[PDB]
Amino acid sequence: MRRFALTVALPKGRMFREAYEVLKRAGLDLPEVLLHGKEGGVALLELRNKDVPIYVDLGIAEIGVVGKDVLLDSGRDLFEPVDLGFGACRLSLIRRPGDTGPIRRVATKYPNFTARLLKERGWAADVVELSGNIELAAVTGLADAVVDVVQTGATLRAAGLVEVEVLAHSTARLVVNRQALKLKRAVLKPLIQRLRELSGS
């Protein structure tokens, strides 16, 4: 945003605090906390993890913190200079263990990632997008399998499902608008370097 020196898009939820605190440790005078900030200062946007890429890609926010799972499903071109380490989880192919029939339909909230994965494997299967509680699509028979994010597996186990295969690993990532990187290099270059020193698995 033109009214702020820098506008930061953060994901509300489990990864918010670690994202906020590491950016602060990296030298960003973030404001106290959905839009926070004073004219000419550093601003903060409390967004849904899934919306972060859009604000950064469009340049509204020069940088943002977003889960790799979301980036893997984003049809946008984002620069991902730092793996922040926290927010660990994974995208997996999940099915009812008793259901070993051919996979003709897959339910997911990651339609792009799923379609890409199916094509890479030369498979043709319908992809049905759902908003939440993806495991129910498998339990009810809506789909033969689902592609969803897993942490401990408590939810899928409680629903009587199993992870047939781990497809991708995810953690919080720092994304930066490429145009902003060039025009605000003096601030963003050192920030990126510092965040790397402050990040591990």
CSV table of C-alpha atoms in Angstrom, one decimal:
chain,number,residue,atom,x,y,z
A,1,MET,CA,0.0,0.0,0.0
A,2,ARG,CA,1.2,3.5,-0.9
A,3,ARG,CA,0.4,4.9,2.6
A,4,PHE,CA,2.8,2.4,4.3
A,5,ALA,CA,6.5,1.9,4.0
A,6,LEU,CA,5.9,-1.8,4.0
A,7,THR,CA,2.7,-3.8,4.2
A,8,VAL,CA,3.0,-7.3,5.6
A,9,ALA,CA,0.5,-10.1,5.0
A,10,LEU,CA,0.3,-12.7,7.8
A,11,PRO,CA,-1.7,-15.8,8.2
A,12,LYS,CA,-4.2,-15.8,11.1
A,13,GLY,CA,-4.1,-19.1,13.1
A,14,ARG,CA,-1.4,-21.4,14.4
A,15,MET,CA,1.4,-19.8,12.4
A,16,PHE,CA,0.6,-16.1,13.2
A,17,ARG,CA,2.6,-15.5,16.4
A,18,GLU,CA,5.8,-17.2,15.2
A,19,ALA,CA,5.5,-15.3,11.9
A,20,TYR,CA,5.0,-12.0,13.7
A,21,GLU,CA,7.8,-12.5,16.2
A,22,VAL,CA,10.4,-13.7,13.7
A,23,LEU,CA,9.7,-10.7,11.4
A,24,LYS,CA,10.1,-8.4,14.5
A,25,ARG,CA,13.4,-10.1,15.4
A,26,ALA,CA,14.5,-9.6,11.8
A,27,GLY,CA,14.2,-5.9,12.1
A,28,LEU,CA,10.7,-5.0,11.1
A,29,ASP,CA,9.0,-2.6,13.5
A,30,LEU,CA,5.7,-4.3,13.2
A,31,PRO,CA,2.7,-2.5,14.8
A,32,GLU,CA,0.9,-4.0,17.8
A,33,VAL,CA,-2.2,-6.1,16.9
A,34,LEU,CA,-7.4,-6.7,10.8
A,35,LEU,CA,-5.2,-3.9,9.3
A,36,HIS,CA,-2.7,-2.3,11.6
A,37,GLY,CA,-0.2,0.5,11.0
A,38,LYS,CA,0.5,4.2,10.9
A,39,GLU,CA,1.2,6.4,7.8
A,40,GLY,CA,4.7,5.7,6.4
A,41,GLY,CA,5.3,2.9,8.9
A,42,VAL,CA,5.2,-0.9,8.7
A,43,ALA,CA,1.6,-2.2,8.3
A,44,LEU,CA,0.2,-5.6,9.2
A,45,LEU,CA,-2.7,-7.5,7.6
A,46,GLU,CA,-4.3,-10.4,9.4
A,47,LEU,CA,-5.4,-12.7,6.5
A,48,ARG,CA,-6.5,-16.2,5.8
A,49,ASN,CA,-3.5,-18.3,5.0
A,50,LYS,CA,-5.1,-19.0,1.6
A,51,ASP,CA,-5.5,-15.3,0.7
A,52,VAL,CA,-1.9,-14.3,1.5
A,53,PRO,CA,-0.5,-15.1,-2.0
A,54,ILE,CA,-3.1,-12.9,-3.7
A,55,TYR,CA,-2.3,-9.8,-1.7
A,56,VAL,CA,1.4,-10.3,-2.3
A,57,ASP,CA,1.1,-11.2,-6.0
A,58,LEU,CA,-1.0,-8.1,-6.6
A,59,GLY,CA,1.5,-6.0,-4.7
A,60,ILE,CA,-0.9,-4.8,-2.0
A,61,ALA,CA,1.5,-6.4,0.5
A,62,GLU,CA,5.2,-6.5,-0.5
A,63,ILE,CA,5.9,-9.6,1.6
A,64,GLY,CA,3.8,-12.3,3.4
A,65,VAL,CA,4.0,-15.5,5.4
A,66,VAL,CA,2.1,-18.4,3.9
A,67,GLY,CA,2.1,-22.2,4.2
A,68,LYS,CA,3.8,-24.1,1.4
A,69,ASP,CA,0.6,-26.2,1.0
A,70,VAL,CA,-1.2,-23.1,-0.1
A,71,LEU,CA,1.6,-22.0,-2.5
A,72,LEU,CA,1.5,-25.5,-4.0
A,73,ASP,CA,-2.1,-24.9,-4.9
A,74,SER,CA,-1.8,-21.3,-6.0
A,75,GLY,CA,-2.1,-20.6,-9.7
A,76,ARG,CA,0.1,-17.5,-9.1
A,77,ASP,CA,3.9,-16.9,-9.6
A,78,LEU,CA,5.4,-16.2,-6.2
A,79,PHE,CA,9.0,-15.7,-5.1
A,80,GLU,CA,9.7,-17.8,-2.1
A,81,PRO,CA,13.1,-16.8,-0.6
A,82,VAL,CA,12.8,-18.3,2.9
A,83,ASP,CA,11.6,-21.5,4.5
A,84,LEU,CA,10.6,-20.2,7.9
A,85,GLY,CA,10.5,-23.7,9.4
A,86,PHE,CA,7.3,-23.6,11.6
A,87,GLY,CA,3.8,-24.6,10.6
A,88,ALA,CA,4.9,-28.1,9.7
A,89,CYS,CA,2.4,-30.4,8.0
A,90,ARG,CA,2.0,-32.5,4.8
A,91,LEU,CA,-0.3,-33.0,1.9
A,92,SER,CA,-1.3,-36.6,1.5
A,93,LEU,CA,-3.5,-38.9,-0.5
A,94,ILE,CA,-6.1,-40.3,1.9
A,95,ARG,CA,-8.6,-43.1,1.5
A,96,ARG,CA,-10.8,-45.5,3.5
A,97,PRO,CA,-8.5,-48.5,4.1
A,98,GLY,CA,-11.2,-50.9,2.9
A,99,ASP,CA,-11.6,-49.0,-0.4
A,100,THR,CA,-9.0,-50.2,-2.8
A,101,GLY,CA,-11.0,-49.7,-6.0
A,102,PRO,CA,-9.8,-47.5,-8.8
A,103,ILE,CA,-9.5,-43.8,-8.1
A,104,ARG,CA,-12.1,-42.1,-10.3
A,105,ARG,CA,-12.9,-39.1,-8.1
A,106,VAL,CA,-10.8,-37.1,-5.6
A,107,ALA,CA,-12.2,-34.5,-3.2
A,108,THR,CA,-9.9,-31.7,-2.0
A,109,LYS,CA,-9.5,-28.0,-1.1
A,110,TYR,CA,-6.2,-28.1,-3.1
A,111,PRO,CA,-7.7,-28.6,-6.7
A,112,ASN,CA,-4.7,-27.2,-8.6
A,113,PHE,CA,-2.1,-29.2,-6.7
A,114,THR,CA,-4.3,-32.3,-7.1
A,115,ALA,CA,-4.9,-31.9,-10.8
A,116,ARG,CA,-1.2,-31.3,-11.4
A,117,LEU,CA,-0.3,-34.4,-9.4
A,118,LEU,CA,-2.8,-36.6,-11.3
A,119,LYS,CA,-1.4,-35.4,-14.6
A,120,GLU,CA,2.2,-35.9,-13.6
A,121,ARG,CA,1.2,-39.5,-13.0
A,122,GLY,CA,-0.7,-39.8,-16.3
A,123,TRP,CA,-4.0,-40.3,-14.5
A,124,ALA,CA,-7.4,-39.0,-15.4
A,125,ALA,CA,-9.7,-38.5,-12.4
A,126,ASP,CA,-12.3,-36.0,-11.5
A,127,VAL,CA,-11.4,-33.4,-8.9
A,128,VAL,CA,-14.2,-32.1,-6.7
A,129,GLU,CA,-13.4,-29.1,-4.7
A,130,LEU,CA,-14.8,-28.9,-1.1
A,131,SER,CA,-14.4,-26.1,1.5
A,132,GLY,CA,-13.8,-28.1,4.7
A,133,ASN,CA,-14.0,-31.4,6.5
A,134,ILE,CA,-12.5,-33.1,3.5
A,135,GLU,CA,-12.2,-36.4,5.3
A,136,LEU,CA,-16.0,-36.7,5.1
A,137,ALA,CA,-15.9,-37.0,1.3
A,138,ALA,CA,-14.0,-40.3,1.8
A,139,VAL,CA,-16.2,-41.6,4.7
A,140,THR,CA,-19.4,-40.9,2.8
A,141,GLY,CA,-18.2,-42.2,-0.5
A,142,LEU,CA,-18.5,-38.8,-2.2
A,143,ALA,CA,-15.0,-39.5,-3.6
A,144,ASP,CA,-12.7,-42.6,-3.8
A,145,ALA,CA,-9.9,-40.6,-2.2
A,146,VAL,CA,-9.0,-37.1,-0.9
A,147,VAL,CA,-6.0,-34.9,-0.9
A,148,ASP,CA,-5.7,-32.9,2.3
A,149,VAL,CA,-3.3,-31.5,4.8
A,150,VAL,CA,-2.2,-33.7,7.8
A,151,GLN,CA,-0.3,-32.8,11.0
A,152,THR,CA,-0.7,-35.6,13.5
A,153,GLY,CA,-3.3,-37.6,11.7
A,154,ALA,CA,-5.7,-37.4,14.6
A,155,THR,CA,-8.6,-36.2,12.4
A,156,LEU,CA,-8.1,-38.8,9.7
A,157,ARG,CA,-7.7,-41.6,12.2
A,158,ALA,CA,-10.9,-40.5,14.1
A,159,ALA,CA,-12.7,-40.6,10.8
A,160,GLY,CA,-11.5,-44.1,10.1
A,161,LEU,CA,-9.2,-43.2,7.2
A,162,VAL,CA,-5.6,-43.8,6.3
A,163,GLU,CA,-2.8,-41.9,4.6
A,164,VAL,CA,-2.0,-44.0,1.5
A,165,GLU,CA,0.8,-41.7,0.4
A,166,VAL,CA,2.6,-38.5,1.4
A,167,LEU,CA,2.6,-36.1,-1.5
A,168,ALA,CA,4.4,-33.0,-0.3
A,169,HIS,CA,5.8,-31.5,2.9
A,170,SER,CA,4.9,-28.0,4.1
A,171,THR,CA,6.1,-25.3,6.4
A,172,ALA,CA,5.6,-21.5,6.6
A,173,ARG,CA,7.3,-19.7,3.8
A,174,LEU,CA,8.2,-16.0,3.2
A,175,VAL,CA,6.9,-14.8,-0.2
A,176,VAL,CA,8.0,-11.5,-1.7
A,177,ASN,CA,6.6,-9.5,-4.6
A,178,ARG,CA,9.3,-9.4,-7.3
A,179,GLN,CA,8.6,-5.8,-8.2
A,180,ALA,CA,8.8,-4.7,-4.6
A,181,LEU,CA,12.1,-6.5,-4.3
A,182,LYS,CA,13.7,-4.4,-7.0
A,183,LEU,CA,12.2,-1.0,-5.9
A,184,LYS,CA,12.6,-1.6,-2.1
A,185,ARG,CA,15.9,-3.6,-2.3
A,186,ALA,CA,17.5,-1.6,0.5
A,187,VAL,CA,15.0,-2.8,3.0
A,188,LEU,CA,14.0,-6.2,1.6
A,189,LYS,CA,17.4,-7.7,0.7
A,190,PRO,CA,18.8,-7.4,4.2
A,191,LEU,CA,15.4,-8.6,5.6
A,192,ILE,CA,15.5,-11.7,3.6
A,193,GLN,CA,19.1,-12.5,4.6
A,194,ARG,CA,18.2,-11.9,8.3
A,195,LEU,CA,15.1,-14.1,8.2
A,196,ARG,CA,17.3,-17.0,6.9
A,197,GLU,CA,19.6,-16.7,9.9
A,198,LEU,CA,16.4,-16.8,12.1
A,199,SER,CA,14.9,-19.8,10.4
A,200,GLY,CA,15.5,-23.6,10.7
A,201,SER,CA,13.3,-26.7,10.4
